[PDB]
């Protein structure tokens, strides 16, 4: 699983604490503040096709990082929405072709009216512990994607979007 981010980040296999850098994409949904799009930046595939299948399941413990400590939201992991932090484990994402398809969105539940947070570059934005599972054998991995931020855009903490 040696894929890349759209900006060109080198993602190594089995590096545990992963320093992978993505781009922020803020928007607004009803009751949701779209912090970041990992789908439109992380396009992946399988490194050794026709014999293995990349299943990714989000392992427990994961919240936001950096300055955000008591802040929680929602994850869109392959269409349907789930809470974030992890009370459970989301369903899998199938990877079976050599095609750079989108991989997931993070949303924030509004506490203020229209307020926001400033994010610096090199600050942590995801503490995501993942799990890569094959199909031939019932095994499991342990990667800690310490996802940081590249661009600095104002992610809203309120019920609307200010731009």
């Amino acid at each position, epitope marked *: 699983f040696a894929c*890349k*981010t759209a*900006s*060109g*980040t*080198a993602i*190594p296999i089995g590096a545990a604490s992963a320093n992978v*850098y*993505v781009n922020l994409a803020p928007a607004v949904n009803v009751g949701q503040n779209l912090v970041v799009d990992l789908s439109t930046q992380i396009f992946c595939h399988n490194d050794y096709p026709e014999t293995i299948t990349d299943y990714v399941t989000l392992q427990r413990g994961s919240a936001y990082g950096g300055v955000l400590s008591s802040f929680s939201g929602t994850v869109k992991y392959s269409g349907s929405s789930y809470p974030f932090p992890t009370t459970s484990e989301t369903p899998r994402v199938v990877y079976n072709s050599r095609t750079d398809k989108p991989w997931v969105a993070l949303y924030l539940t509004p506490v203020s009216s229209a307020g926001g947070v*400033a*994010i*610096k*570059a*090199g600050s942590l934005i995801a503490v995501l512990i993942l799990r890569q599972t094959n199909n031939y054998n019932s095994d499991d991995f342990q990667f800690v994607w310490n996802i*940081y931020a*590249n*661009n*600095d*855009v104002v992610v809203p903490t309120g019920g609307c979007d200010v731009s």
Partner: antibody, heavy 119, light 108 residues
Framework: VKLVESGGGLVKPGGSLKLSCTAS????????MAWVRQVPGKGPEWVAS????????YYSDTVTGRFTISRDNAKNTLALEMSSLRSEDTAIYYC?????????????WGQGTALTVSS | DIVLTQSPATLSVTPGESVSLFCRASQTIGNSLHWYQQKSHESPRLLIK???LSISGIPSRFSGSGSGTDFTLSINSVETEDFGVFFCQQSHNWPITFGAGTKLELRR
């Protein structure tokens, strides 16, 4: 993509100057900036960089504690107040655009201004 | 920190052949290395982004390969317009320290 640099010349050691960078043709608010100086006949040297809104500044090993770098995102300008001249600063300066992850690599390069030191 | 070493410094090559140049970093980098081409007295221009991908507007005659510490930038066919200096650039950990640059010239 056009990049405009201003502020070159010949100065004594211990002077102070402002280098001004003006950008056009792309999105300024999504993408970082840096300054790169080049000695003629010698490899490039980096001195200063700054991230998106004005959130963080970065320098190289021999530059920290000396330079001032700032940005204005309303008028799309990058300003360098530099006041620590020595004999090694005889170089041509390009203002360049830090695209990609953690603003690392350089997308387009401007013409730059020359800066030379003499007594 | 990290220093960049080029090999060779200078090489005079007859046009029409295929050339390959190398840049070596101090530590592990992955594939986060870039190249610049300065033909004459102007701003240098990038050729290959992240050692495997090209930039549109730059032709496919420039190719990149390798990972880890060693990289290869190759030109399959050279002519009277690509002579100049090659710059290699490391972007793994702060701060950024460049390389010397390889001068490629043509016999005439």
């Amino acid at each position: 993509v056009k990049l405009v640099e201003s502020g070159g010349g010949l100065v004594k050691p211990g002077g102070s100057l402002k280098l001004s960078c003006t950008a056009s043709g792309f999105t300024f608010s999504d993408n970082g900036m840096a300054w790169v100086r080049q000695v003629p006949g010698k490899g490039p040297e980096w001195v200063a960089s700054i991230t998106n809104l004005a959130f963080s500044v970065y320098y190289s090993d021999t530059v920290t504690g000396r330079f001032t770098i700032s940005r204005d995102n309303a008028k799309n300008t990058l300003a360098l107040e530099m006041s620590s001249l020595r004999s090694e600063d005889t170089a041509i300066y390009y203002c360049a655009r830090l695209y990609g992850d953690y603003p690392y690599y350089f997308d387009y390069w401007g013409q730059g201004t020359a800066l030379t030191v003499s007594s | 920190d990290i220093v960049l070493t080029q090999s060779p410094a200078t090489l005079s090559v007859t046009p029409g052949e295929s050339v390959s140049l190398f840049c070596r970093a101090s530590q592990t980098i992955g594939n986060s290395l870039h190249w610049y081409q300065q033909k004459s007295h102007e701003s240098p221009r990038l050729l290959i982004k992240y050692s495997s991908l090209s930039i549109s507007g730059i032709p496919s005659r420039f190719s990149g390969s390798g990972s880890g510490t060693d990289f290869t930038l190759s030109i399959n066919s050279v002519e009277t317009e690509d002579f100049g200096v090659f710059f290699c650039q490391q972007s793994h950990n702060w701060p950024i320290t460049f390389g010397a640059g390889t001068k490629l010239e043509l016999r005439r």
